[PDB]
């Protein structure tokens, strides 16, 4: 098959274009990027700039103010490489020009994660168990990486979906890569599109027409720093599926009865990407 | 202690013979060669040719129509190495030719499994909970993988059984191996027999009275590929266990009350090993 | 800041002194050795020379007598380096006088690590729901490793408090350290003195008010052989907390409702130890 990625704009889509290209997308891909969403590189970098400052130029005591005291990357900061998360609330910033740059950077990715969550539900036909809005009213998380100078194992993400923008390598080496086709397949920067991973969420809710596809981090030398923002659009905890038809669509559920929430399949904590079983 | 594998005939095992030694080999070992149920080395060529072929000439188009939206390795195909999942209901064939021969192919080794672990309850006194028929039409799952040219760390099973045929590795390269009386204990190839691991379903359902061994695989070279074809017999989400006898036997239950399912205890998804735990 | 580990004294705590102090590095640091616990060297090395005879000197069957059938490491005799493991019952001792001396090595580590966490809870103004006593009558663990001749990747403790022993290498190389400061702190062998850690749940409880550090376990030779006694105070499965309040101090639960207990949001085994994401 063609191993290329596509673009759709979040646009075009609202306005019923493409509807058999974005349906096949979804189910043998179930990756793209994403033009038209509101999502500007001016803006990941005036985010980014600020972010990067207080990596760089932040004082331990002034990152300890925002550490969480458990190491759990929900939110605040975390050293380990550096990261910065946030999520709708319960949200820990340095200061006030941070907080309202990021504040609003978060909003713009949540807007986006639901409008395209919104589409891939409509080109399904799908209207989730308590309806569409309350599904993507939910439990997102945002983290933002630097990385300084394969690199992480195929895993597949557990998401409804998974909007990732980045700052490209200097030297222009391409770091991430997703399977396409039995492929590796390059997931380049692009200043004028997010990149869109559908998760394992995406494929249940739809009863198996949306693919979550597996992805990892190459490794390449000088100029390879990068950062990544990475957004995921993760449902509420009372989140209500068919066994039957998630045993349908390859999910190895171990749930009695006919009906579970997303508590029951994944348990009390977030869980956001998953690996191929070695067994 | 002898270090040795054994071996049963099943045949004998349900005419009620060598019921000390089984006995003992469940309590002491937890894994033995079996005989004479069933599994023939001429069936498991003619399955593994038949998927192999797939897996060489198949196009992407004929793998992507046996491929799961959710790259679980529950149903179909999965590329990494390469495997074909299936189980009672829900698979996903590449022919009709195909479809026959893996039908009775599982058959055989469901039906294998049944009636070994049919016979470790037998020879352990024990009756689960709702009964033994019950606990035995239950939610299997076969994988049958192919390795090209220790590369695996030590796992123990969470099965009631596992069911392992292999083919051997050109060179006669032996790569599975298991703890046996604290040593290192080859686990060839046998034209003429099936390995049993017991897992932890059994020490848990038998009130601790059978073995769950740690294995693994070990790494050699020209000639070195090899196949497997591994049959997990597990239990249904609802069997249900007293709390106290599992912290008797070594399980480190984290559970309120005095009985308690599977479900209760894995989780909302089956997981199908474990690993010794590093803290 | 001072990257330095703290040291108290139980009694001195006990009697009301050095609260501030307490509290600071509970927040800050969420580590300290502590002095005056009923935890001497002496004893110490009663109960590790005993169990290193066995080690040493136990039989295949001696060390088979005490192991469980599942490789969990919850009690008895684990081969991998070799492990020795305890709790409150169902306890598995090679003979009369290991009994007693590990008996009453258990039982001073279980008396200290509730004594050092009724202070935590009282410097940080906390009652569990359902009150100290029943929060701190729960279930511990206690493991024993001998390590022959960075070795562990960070982790940070999903107890109430973690109880550490070690004794030194030959050579003098420390092989603990811990994150204090956004530092690699040394964690040394003191005869005098016991080192703690504050778990998950001491965060969890106290409603963010102790932080719970991230350790590993760094690599050197000859001399380097070494051991650790580590004692885990874990709560009961029906320990129960607030979902928001556990939200707001970073826990990324998924748990619907306006309460929880620790089964719920673990599990249905105890997990011990948890590393920081990749996602």
């Known amino acids: 098959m063609d191993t290329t990625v596509p673009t759709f704009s979040l646009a075009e889509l609202q306005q019923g274009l493409h509807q058999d290209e974005f349906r096949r997308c979804l189910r043998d891909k179930g990756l793209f990027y994403l033009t038209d969403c509101g999502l500007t590189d001016t803006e990941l970098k005036s985010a980014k700039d600020l972010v990067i400052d207080f990596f760089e130029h932040g004082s331990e005591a002034e990152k300890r103010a925002v550490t969480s005291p458990v190491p759990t990357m929900r939110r605040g900061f975390t050293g380990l490489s550096m990261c910065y998360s946030m999520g709708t609330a319960d949200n820990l910033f340095p200061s006030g020009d941070f907080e309202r740059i990021w504040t609003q950077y978060f909003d713009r990715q949540y807007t986006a994660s639901r409008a395209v969550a919104r589409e891939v539900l409509r080109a399904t036909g799908t209207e989730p168990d308590g309806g569409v809005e309350a599904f993507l009213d939910c439990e997102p998380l945002l983290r933002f990486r630097y990385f300084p100078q394969l690199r992480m194992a195929p895993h597949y993400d557990l998401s409804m979906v998974t909007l990732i923008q980045q700052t490209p390598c200097a030297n222009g080496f391409v770091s991430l890569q997703a399977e396409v086709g039995g492929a590796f397949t ?94």
């Open 186 to 279: 390059d997931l380049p920067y692009r200043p004028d599109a997010v990149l869109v991973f559908c998760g394992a969420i995406a494929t249940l809710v739809t009863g198996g027409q949306v693919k979550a596809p597996r992805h990892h981090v190459a490794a390449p030398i000088a100029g390879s720093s990068r950062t990544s923002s990475v957004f995921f659009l993760r449902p509420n905890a009372d989140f209500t599926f068919s066994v039957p038809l998630a045993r349908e669509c390859g999910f190895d559920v171990s749930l009695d009865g006919e009906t579970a929430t997303f508590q029951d399949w994944i348990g009390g904590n977030y869980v956001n990407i998953r690996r191929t079983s070695k067994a």
